[PDB]
């Protein structure tokens, strides 16, 4: 199959910036009829992909002129001249020349802002959940930037990997930050058989993790 390689994986931009996204195919995508079926799509959360450019360089109807596509052979580029807020989202390239048709992995265009360490908060199981026989420990890692972050749970100093579920928000409309929730779920029996619970946040803003804990 034709592999479509998109770079960069993510591109931070300020409004009004120039933006340029690359898509490279692993082999030629010239169809036997002579055409090159290379398309660019923009997709926002909860919506279908919207077609921006078709056949390499042709702007689809209703698409603002600030979008333009170019390329030849295995080498393709999408440019945005003066990025606006509605341009933020994930961009995909698609080759339609050789079956199976294949997409690039996507490039996220996101709003640039100052780096910001997460605000980390940890919460023991509620009495109500314990009564019901369950035990969930919740850690919020809020309003950080950039989006990459890692969380580690420690029970009595020991790293726990099972029973952890994570969720991430989309970039905040007001402060351009990201947030993450991490939940460690145990039986009540096992929760009461330990003392210290710890969530550790590793983020680019520091060399040392932000560590938050409570002791039963």
């Amino acid at each position: 199959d034709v592999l479509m390689t998109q770079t960069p994986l993510s591109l931070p931009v300020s409004l009004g910036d120039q933006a340029s996204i690359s898509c490279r195919s692993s082999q030629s995508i010239v169809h036997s009829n002579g055409n090159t079926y290379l398309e660019w799509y923009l997709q926002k959360p909860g919506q279908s992909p919207k077609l921006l450019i078709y056949k390499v360089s042709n702007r689809f109807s209703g698409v603002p002129d600030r979008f333009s596509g170019s390329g030849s052979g295995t080498d393709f580029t999408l440019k945005i001249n003066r990025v606006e807020a509605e341009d933020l989202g994930i961009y995909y390239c698609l080759q339609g020349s050789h079956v199976p048709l294949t997409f690039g992995a996507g490039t996220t265009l996101e709003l640039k802002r100052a780096d910001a360490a997460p605000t980390v908060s940890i919460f023991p199981p509620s009495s109500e959940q314990l009564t019901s026989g369950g035990a969930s420990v919740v850690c919020f890692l809020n309003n950080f930037y950039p989006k990459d972050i890692n969380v580690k749970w420690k029970i009595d100093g020991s790293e726990r990997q099972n029973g952890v579920l994570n969720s991430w928000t989309d970039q905040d409309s007001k402060d351009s930050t990201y947030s993450m929730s991490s939940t460690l779920t145990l039986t009540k029996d096992e929760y009461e058989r330990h003392n210290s619970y710890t969530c550790e946040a590793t983020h680019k803003t520091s060399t040392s993790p932000i560590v938050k804990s409570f002791n039963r």
């Binding site: 398309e39 996507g106 940890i122 928000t169 929730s181």
Partner: protein, 211 residues
């Protein structure tokens, strides 16, 4: 105007099959190709195959040959994607797209497919209170299906709120919501999370009180 109407969201029992529909209008049905595209939550797009109702010709991405079957009803301008023996990996949005040969495609809005054996179940709502600003939260656990609506103080508290996407585990959804307020506002004033679940026709409130 070329339009594609996809069927509504599907809740599918594990192991069962589901048949999704894409009904077209605004062009000669037998002269356009229909493609199906899969997108798992938070992931990219994956091409399933193409189908040409006008001849019954088709091609499947090898990755989907044992999973997908394309059919059509020319009498209703509808193409179908049947997915067999569903697993958690089949939970995704499925888009249909239509185009004439050498012309640009039009995409449907997509159909959400969720695999679970759960019946309709209201959420258990648990307060998250701490052990200048203070962060509080609510854990919304064990419900089915999506969605729920979470507000704080009946909507009056909207700044500083983060409601996280739900995660399906053991056939049921769980989500959390956090809110951050000045320390001089809580616990001195009331902070309450409100959780509505349309499918079970329920709405519950949980006041956050100090531990």
């Amino acid at each position: 105007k070329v339009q594609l109407q996809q069927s509504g969201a599907e809740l599918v029992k594990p192991g069962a099959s589901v048949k999704l529909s894409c009904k077209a209008s605004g062009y000669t049905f037998t002269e356009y190709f229909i493609h199906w595209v899969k997108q798992r939550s938070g992931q990219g797009l994956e091409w399933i195959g193409w189908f040409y109702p006008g001849s019954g010709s088709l091609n499947y991405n090898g990755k989907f040959k044992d999973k997908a079957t394309f059919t059509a009803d020319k009498s209703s301008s509808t193409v179908y994607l049947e997915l067999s023996r569903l697993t958690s990996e089949d939970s995704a949005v499925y888009f249909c797209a239509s185009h004439a040969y050498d012309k640009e495609p039009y995409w449907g809005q997509g159909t959400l497919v969720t695999v679970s054996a759960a019946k309709t179940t209201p959420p258990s709502v648990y307060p998250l209170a701490p052990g200048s600003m203070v962060t509080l939260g609510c854990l919304v656990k064990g419900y089915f299906p999506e969605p729920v609506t979470v507000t704080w103080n009946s909507g009056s508290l909207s700044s500083g709120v983060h409601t996280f996407p739900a995660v399906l585990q053991s056939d049921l959804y769980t989500l959390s919501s956090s809110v951050t307020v000045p320390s001089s506002t809580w616990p001195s004033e009331t902070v309450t999370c409100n959780v509505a679940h349309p499918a079970s026709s329920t709405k519950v409130d949980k006041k956050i009180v100090p531990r």
